[PDB]
């Protein structure tokens, strides 16, 4: 069809960059992060919605691979929080090993330039994000090291309240949006060049983050509230504040977020959600945030990662212009990552102070007096 | 003096690379890793043997900055082990922030080429190492992420036994050298290109590591046993196995390791230790491993980081040739890091399997059956 050829041409011209995929957690579930001699299975998986053959088939240009670990369930709160940090490094490790063992398909990217150079070579631009602040174990130092390991967005919560912000799906509220720590962390995230992700966060937490953030944010996988009322979806209030923020809402394929009955959800519903946001806040603030492998089953026509050409063709069929489809595919999320890095460079160039952790005193006054006495002895030599 | 001018010329021609300095832990002790508006103090410290003015004065070419955290003291063994991992990321964070805030003095390096390019520009080549396996929290995944963060050596123990190896200063013995896990970790360290450091490890643990390792190792800060009997010093047995391994013993300035009475220790004792090893196993297997800021007081003439020109002049005064002094200064430790990276490239190029952690099963048989049933449904479409 001339529409199918058009969709294939667009997928070759610009990268379709998906906002969120939990394929790394499926590798932890199925293989337990042991991928040695598992290429046959990694190319043709016996479970899930993602594998390396189907990833090629769908012509996907880039991917933010999620490094999610569950919210801590342990009665010992210190152990659970610290356990999440160790599991985070295990998931970042298997993501890096997955990319490194398959260099013909996947290539690591952590910027707008690295996404393009990956797309020119014919690879899937492989970026990384974490699904929740619980993953850092209350350590802003750890968060900066996660940025150094290649993490380029941080979802503020998953399905649990943390010290920084409230989750959408948990009641009662803890902070009523962001905490004081949360407000201060927004400045640090803008300073370091970490992209803020407002998926899974409460409506009040979104409103406060959108007003405070000096850089554009994203919703890595969230849908529209007006079309389907759910705690996880974005309200018209927050859609307008996203426009002022210059952020992007990357539309989710979760069936619960598209229809009241999950079995009724379809590819057409995803297109309705993209067109709604594109009509009201412009097509330069809308994206694609599948959440593949964060669900058992997908919508009719969006069953797995091979179905992206159907989404591009469906948007063109509805009268969304080529230029606007290219924006929704990936140009918008590239711009936000580019603007996040530019803001960080401005703030780092200006010499803004970084947020430091609260640490225990290791030395008492006796030790500090010995050290000062010792220094003075060396001065008199 | 013609000997002082000779020492200054050598320090400009080749980088003097010190094996171990604990200045990052002094920053944790004094500032609690909060260096915002502390440049006056960082250039002229009120404590310790290291600051940025004295670092320039001594003409030091490179430095392995230690990222040490204490051995876990907590009764809850899980909490203590996981706490060491979080503290490790705090110390790696402050090392990176120290380098980044002072780019005219310090420059990050993680290879032989990066050491040289740093030295050409007139910076101190700033490398990173961790002082003990307890710092990884039994996570080989975490260890690979520490390598990604810039860690280029790992001391197998500090002053405590761990799951992998025995420390020198603790009795009774636990593993009697390396454990089975330790033996398997040696292969993984060689594969990833992590330099093995045998300081703080028991004599038996050294012997087993030196025979097993396929790449050259180091002693980042250890002295000679024959001159001064101590658990921390290297025996003639292990010095010979270091020669076969092609490693380097970087001589320590700790007074306890140089003389029976600590107040008697001197610059002359450090030179005796360098000449002993250089005479018996050749000058291409000897280095300088100060351990500055891992001690209150240093030897007479080696009080702080400004005293390196006295060490170079002292070696030349004793009849050690210019070419051999250049080797002891830094060419040897550069070679070992270069050979460690070459061995890793050979093993990674050959497609050797990496060591994976033992993970818990997250899904039961009910969940796995749903995932396989779901995959088959998608196959029939
Ligand atoms: Cl602490
Ligand atoms: Cl686990
Ligand atoms: Zn997810
Ligand atoms: Zn999610
Ligand atoms: Zn030390
Ligand atoms: Zn030490």
Curated annotation (Swiss-Prot), chains A, B:
Pfam families: Peptidase_M19. Zn(2+) binds at residues 20, 22, 131. Its cofactor is Zn(2+). It comes from Aspergillus fumigatus (strain ATCC MYA-4609 / CBS 101355 / FGSC A1100 / Af293) (Neosartorya fumigata). Keywords: Dipeptidase, Disulfide bond, Hydrolase, Metal-binding, Metalloprotease, Protease, Virulence, Zinc. SUPFAM superfamilies: Metallo-dependent hydrolases. Pathway: Mycotoxin biosynthesis. InterPro entries: Metal_Hydrolase, Pept_M19. It is an enzyme of class 3 (hydrolase). PANTHER family: DIPEPTIDASE (PTHR10443:SF12), MICROSOMAL DIPEPTIDASE (PTHR10443). Its EC number is 3.4.13.19. It comes from the Eukaryota. Belongs to the metallo-dependent hydrolases superfamily. Peptidase M19 family. GO terms for biological process: gliotoxin biosynthetic process; mycotoxin biosynthetic process; proteolysis; symbiont-mediated suppression of host immune response. Dipeptidase; part of the gene cluster that mediates the biosynthesis of gliotoxin, a member of the epipolythiodioxopiperazine (ETP) class of toxins characterized by a disulfide bridged cyclic dipeptide. The first step in gliotoxin biosynthesis is the condensation of serine and phenylalanine to form the cyclo-L-phenylalanyl-L-serine diketopiperazine (DKP) by the NRPS gliP. GliP is also able to produce the DKP cyclo-L-tryptophanyl-L-serine, suggesting that the substrate specificity of the first adenylation (A) domain in gliP is sufficiently relaxed to accommodate both L-Phe and L-Trp. Substrate binds at residues 158, 232, 291. Disulfide bonds join 71-160. This is Dipeptidase gliJ. One of its GO terms (molecular function) is metallodipeptidase activity. It catalyses: an L-aminoacyl-L-amino acid + H2O = 2 an L-alpha-amino acid.
């Amino acid at each position: 069809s001339p529409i199918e050829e058009q969709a294939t041409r667009l997928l070759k011209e610009v990268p379709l960059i998906d906002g969120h995929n939990d394929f790394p957690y499926m590798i932890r579930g199925w293989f337990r992060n042991d991928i040695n001699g598992q290429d046959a299975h990694l190319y043709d998986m016996p479970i899930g919605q993602t594998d390396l053959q189907r990833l090629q088939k769908g012509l996907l240009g880039g991917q933010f691979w999620s490094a999610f670990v569950p919210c801590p369930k342990n009665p010992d709160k210190e152990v659970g929080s610290l356990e999440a940090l160790r599991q985070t490094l295990q998931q970042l490790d298997v993501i890096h090993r997955l990319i490194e063992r398959h260099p013909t398909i996947l290539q690591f990217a952590d910027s707008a330039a690295s996404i393009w150079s990956s797309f020119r070579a014919g690879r899937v631009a492989s970026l990384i994000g974490i699904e929740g602040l619980h993953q850092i174990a209350d350590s802003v130092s750890a968060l900066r090291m996660l940025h150094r390991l290649g993490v380029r967005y941080v979802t503020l919560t998953h399905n649990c309240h943390n010290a920084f912000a409230d989750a959408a799906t948990v009641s009662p509220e803890l902070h009523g949006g962001l905490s004081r720590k949360g407000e201060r962390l927004i400045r640090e995230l803008n300073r370091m060049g970490m992209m803020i992700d407002l998926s899974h966060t409460s409506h009040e937490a979104q409103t406060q983050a959108l007003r405070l953030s000096r850089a554009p944010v994203i919703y890595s996988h969230s849908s529209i509230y007006s079309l389907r009322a759910h705690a996880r979806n974005v309200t018209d209030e927050n859609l307008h504040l996203l426009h002022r923020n210059r952020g992007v809402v990357m539309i989710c394929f979760l069936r619960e977020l598209l229809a009241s009955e999950a079995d009724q959800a379809t590819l057409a519903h995803v297109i309705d959600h993209i067109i709604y946001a594109g009509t009201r806040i412009g097509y330069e603030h809308v994206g694609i945030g599948s959440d593949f492998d964060g669900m058992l089953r997908g919508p009719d026509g969006l069953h797995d990662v091979s179905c992206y050409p159907a989404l591009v063709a469906g948007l063109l069929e509805r009268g969304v212009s080529e230029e606007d489809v290219k924006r929704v595919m990936g140009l918008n999320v590239i711009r936000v990552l580019e603007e996040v890095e530019r803001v960080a460079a401005e703030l780092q160039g200006a010499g803004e102070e970084c947020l430091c952790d609260e640490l225990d005193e290791v030395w008492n006054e006796d030790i500090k007096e010995q050290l000062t006495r010792e220094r003075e002895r060396v001065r008199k030599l």
